[PDB]
């Protein structure tokens, strides 16, 4: 397993087969797989050094770990992009020994530099990922080179975790399972050699090929992405508010000790005692319960303020903050969620230093139909489409049809303030009753950002009490079309900053 | 095995089998099976018996639904055989449906 | 506080303290079957570098353990490794049991 | 093997419980009996 932690260095050596035994399409599969792997690894913003060595009858080095540019994602991506399949026409044999000896030469050159006795070299871990069919027909047995690799790093029983050799064969090409198993490192409780069919399965397997368990710093957005993980692992920021043994409103962790939730959950309660926030826990499946010490309600929120004018309910300024009385120990089951208009969101998007949230708004909501997700009652993740631009104008018009609740004309300027986002149109799901406050997030560069929280809607698909899982479907003839809404976080920056200026670092 | 008191002939009813696991921190891996009965055409036909492998979470229970439509009268036996993996437990429950 | 543990069907393996390299030895894992049902299992040792097994390494031996009884299986092995090895013996039963 | 066991400790005040779990086949391996520290040894120590 490729260990992830804040201490040390991770030298990644990606070897790609470039022989006659792999065709051009298989080489494209290998290249896109390596691109995906190098993209995912850099998402954790750790110290990583990546070296690309496409190998054939002779070993050709495309980028050097010793080179100081190995700590840049775009440079490595561009260097891998310039790989050529025809560069090895003179020699089309598979020479695994050449690649392994090139890796050994790189490692020895690094060892001579900076001094072997220095702890900086001692704390370096290695990970060699070979994408090949394994049929190495010349140059010598891989065992000699592997033993040489072990001896240079003196990989004993105690230091067995400092060298990981993988052998992943992805594509239609025939793969000898025995050879791939022999090439991969032999460890007691994990698999190091795989055979696959496409790149999505490789993404899943690579998601299993890491362990963020040793990482416990306050990083936002980072979360699992494999489909075989628990529902809480995929959305660690999901926390829940329990008034009295009931499971009413959801939330999102925005810091070590803060939670952001809708303000209409705390309608008729000022006794913060007996209120418990359920937070995911690595051990128990029901989570650990925390106590809230300060609940802040937006002063501009008043449901019945426009009652006389004809607006039965107006959900403006529907936002609240919670401060747990105890610090949440970050783990693999609970991590914050990236909020925009802050330094960490800028860092997670790999944007220039001199950025402003005016650019963040366009970067994160450029499309006229931006995909987004929110968490269901049972913990699953659903899909919606936030609509901006001219497409937003048609959205609010549908509310005017619902004159049974507000008899007035109810145009966009009156009921649907600019603070709300569309959803629920065409092939889009709608939240049930009991999902208010749940983050409406979106994924960018393998990192999750929050761009709003559920506020209200026009149809509850959980009215039928079949189960907590079954969800009704709105009939096509259902007179009010489903048209949900979510408070937009960007418009609420003036309220956010003065309440969280010290906790975070806003732009 | 949860059954209705009595199901009228030619009525489609979803009987269920609830498996309870009482281990504190262990997860059972049971292989439930529905035996074929001539009186009602279960999902298990005479050619192939119906078997499902279900994993029960610790300190929890899992419900396996079955659909049986009776085309005969009287009292007939509904049997489900469950065998646990690595725990030797082969408990199976048989009941009578009117 | 006495606290006993049990399996009701397990493999018991007792290696010697140490063995000279290149000197043939015999492993005698024993299957214990304390269940009430007569059984039948297949026992094989996972091949590993440094061990010169018999037959190549991947072969398995069929052995049946009656109810409330034990049975040993002999595996001749000449360890040709240098320092140490980690040998694993796996017994797998039928789908009926 | 691998089960989770709930172990309860109870005293009359704050105390430093010194725990230890030991195999029993060690006694069979040992040629001669080697009794552990029990209340008899403590009582002999006090009255010595």
């Amino acid at each position: 397993k490729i260990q992830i932690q804040r201490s040390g260095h991770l030298n990644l050596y990606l070897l790609l087969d470039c022989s006659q035994s792999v065709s051009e399409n298989d080489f494209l599969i290998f290249k896109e797989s390596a691109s995906l792997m190098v993209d995912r690894i850099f998402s954790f913003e750790i110290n990583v050094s990546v070296a690309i060595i496409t190998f054939a009858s002779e070993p050709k080095v495309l980028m050097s770990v010793l080179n100081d540019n190995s700590r840049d994602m775009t440079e490595v991506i561009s260097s891998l992009e310039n790989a050529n399949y025809k560069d090895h026409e003179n020699g089309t044999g598979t020479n695994t020994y050449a690649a392994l000896n090139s890796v050994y030469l790189m490692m020895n050159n690094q060892m001579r530099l900076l001094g072997m006795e220095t702890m900086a070299w001692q704390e370096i871990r290695h990970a060699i990922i070979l994408l090949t069919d394994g049929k190495s027909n010349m140059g010598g047995s891989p065992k000699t080179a592997v033993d040489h690799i072990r001896e240079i790093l003196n990989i004993n029983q105690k230091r067995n975790d400092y060298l990981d050799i993988y052998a992943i064969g992805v594509g239609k090409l025939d793969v000898d399972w025995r050879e791939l198993n022999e090439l991969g490192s032999k460890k007691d409780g994990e698999r190091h050699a795989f055979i696959l069919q496409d790149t999505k399965a490789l993404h899943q397997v690579f998601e299993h090929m890491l362990d963020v368990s040793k990482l416990t710093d306050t990083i936002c957005g980072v979360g699992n992405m494999s489909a075989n993980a628990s529902d809480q692992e995929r959305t660690p920021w999901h926390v829940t508010i329990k008034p009295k043994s009931q499971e009413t409103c959801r939330g999102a962790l925005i810091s070590d000790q803060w939670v952001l939730t809708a303000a209409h959950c705390f309608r008729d309660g000022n006794d913060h005692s007996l209120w418990r926030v359920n937070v995911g826990d690595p051990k128990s499946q029901w989570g650990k319960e925390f106590l809230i010490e300060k609940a802040v309600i937006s002063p501009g929120f008043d449901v019945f303020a426009k009652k006389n004018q004809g607006i039965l309910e107006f959900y403006g300024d529907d936002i609240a903050l919670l401060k747990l009385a105890q610090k949440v120990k970050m783990s693999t089951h609970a991590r914050p969620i990236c909020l925009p208009c802050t330094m960490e969101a800028n860092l997670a998007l790999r944007r220039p230093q001199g950025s402003t949230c005016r650019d963040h708004e366009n970067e994160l909501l450029n499309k006229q139909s931006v995909p987004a997700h929110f968490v269901a009652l049972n913990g699953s993740k659903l899909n919606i489409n936030l609509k901006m631009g001219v497409e937003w104008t048609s959205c609010a018009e549908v509310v005017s049809q619902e004159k049974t609740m507000f008899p007035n004309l109810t145009d966009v300027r009156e009921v649907v303030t600019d603070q709300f986002l569309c959803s629920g149109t065409q092939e889009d799901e709608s939240p049930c009753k009991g999902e208010a406050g749940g983050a409406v997030f979106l994924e960018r560069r393998f990192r999750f950002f929050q761009v709003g929280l559920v506020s209200w809607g026009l149809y509850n698909p959980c009215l039928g009490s079949a189960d907590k899982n079954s969800r009704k479907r709105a009939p096509r003839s259902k007179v009010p079309p489903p048209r949900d809404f979510h408070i937009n976080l960007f418009r609420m920056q003036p309220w956010l900053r003065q309440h969280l200026g010290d906790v975070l670092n806003f732009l | 095995l949860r059954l209705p008191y009595s199901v009228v002939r030619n009525e489609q009813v979803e009987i269920r089998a609830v498996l309870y696991n009482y281990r504190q921190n262990q997860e059972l891996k049971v292989r439930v099976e529905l035996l074929h009965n001539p009186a009602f055409c279960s999902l298990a036909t005479t050619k192939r018996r119906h078997q499902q492998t279900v994993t029960i979470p610790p300190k929890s229970s899992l419900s396996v639904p079955y659909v049986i439509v009776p085309l005969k009268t009287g009292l007939q036996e509904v049997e489900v055989k469950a065998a646990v993996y690595h725990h030797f437990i082969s408990d199976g429950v048989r009941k009578s449906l009117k | 506080v006495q606290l006993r543990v049990f399996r009701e069907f397990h493999l018991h393996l007792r290696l010697p303290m140490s063995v000279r390299r290149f000197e043939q030895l015999e492993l005698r894992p024993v299957l214990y079957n304390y269940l009430d049902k007569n059984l039948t299992v297949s026992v094989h040792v996972s091949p590993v570098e440094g061990l010169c097994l018999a037959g190549g390494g991947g072969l398995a031996q069929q052995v049946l353990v009656p109810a409330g009884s034990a049975r040993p299986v002999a595996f001749s092995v000449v360890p040709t490794a240098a320092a140490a090895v980690s040998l694993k013996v796996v017994a797998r039963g039928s789908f009926e049991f | 093997n691998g089960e989770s066991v709930k172990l309860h400790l109870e005293t009359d005040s704050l105390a430093l419980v010194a725990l230890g779990a030991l195999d029993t086949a060690l006694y069979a391996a040992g040629s001669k009996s080697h009794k552990p520290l029990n209340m008899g040894k403590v009582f002999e120590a006090m009255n010595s």
């Binding site: - | 891996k29 | 297949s42 069929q62 694993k88 796996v90 797998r92 039928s94 789908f95 | 691998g2």
Partner: peptide, 20 residues
């Protein structure tokens, strides 16, 4: 082969825990 042989109808061998 004096008696029968039940080959490849046995357990997966991956679900059997390893005691070490």
């Amino acid at each position: 082969a004096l008696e029968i042989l039940q080959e490849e109808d046995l357990i997966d061998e991956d679900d059997i825990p390893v005691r070490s």
